[PDB]
Design a protein around this ligand. Sequence first.
Ligand code: MET
Ligand SMILES: [Mg+2]
Length: 364
Amino acid sequence: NTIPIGIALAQTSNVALLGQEQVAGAKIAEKYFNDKGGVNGTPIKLIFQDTAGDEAGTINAFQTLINKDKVVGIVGPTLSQQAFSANPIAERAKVPVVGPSNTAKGIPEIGDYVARVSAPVSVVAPNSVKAALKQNPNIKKVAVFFAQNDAFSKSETEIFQQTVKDQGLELVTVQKFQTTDTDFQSQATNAINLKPDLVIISGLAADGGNLVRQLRELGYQGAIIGGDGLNTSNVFAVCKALCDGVLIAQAYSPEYTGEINKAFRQAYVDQYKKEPPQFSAQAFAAVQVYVESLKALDTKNKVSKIQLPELRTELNKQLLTGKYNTPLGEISFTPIGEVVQKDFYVAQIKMEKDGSQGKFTFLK
Ligand code: MET
Ligand SMILES: [Mg+2]
């Protein structure tokens, strides 16, 4: 006998460039917690249902997990764009959802069954602008790009734009694109002609990487900040050597000294031969929230005897009250399921000159 937890992430489509790291983190969590006896002796079982890259796919994944797989709760989805459409399905069904990396404004507000372990754009994004200004205090003109078809990108770019204004910088242009675009010559040239010292991009991985590369191809030599959608080594293949120098804020640091992060990091590093990326840590933390909440609930009210609808409701109630020592640091939730997290960072992409390999270097 095992306790089913649903994992609804992008395992196909271009969104899987972001989902990949999350699936990896979730699998590491499953082994980590089951090796510790699962929920008071009862193993958990992660049940994966691919969301693909759109809303319909996420709705279908949630409904399958809820109705066929009878999961006690869901971790997912990958994108805020997907969460806004699909999470209300779980809310109405009274099934908890914990978002691992949905950072758009308004996610926890979707309902009483929606929480997230991922700090939102308003708290993560401004640090990368401050970091850019530290590396070049003479930055004055800023060009901003964003994917207008993506909910998170629209949310993130508003934060970036306000931060630019508050830092006393000149916003010379705001350019729009679609996440499905591969070509950005017109927008990139429009920005370059305005001589920005800093470019900020809010998109996803393939699009963001393509835009970074094209900006460099077209001769742009200034600073570049990428938003959370570019926060994966999967961009390295796209912009290659031209990814070098891109600043990306982080809601996770491998060097954080919590015991579980040490164990998570070591488990990750030993397998993947590189530092755990943010999306992997965040997915681990989401599974952790479910395991530790299930343990706490089971101790007070043996879960093997609770019928599924009540189990879901009590698990949701429980997880909202918990304090968790996760790879992300010590976290908890507000009464509406917003994450409470103290520490944030900025990393910078460092490419090898050949362009075949790179890493994220954390700024001190
Ligand atoms: C794992 S990709 C997440 C991208 C962005 N944080 C969003 O909310 O969609
Ligand atoms: Mg909520």
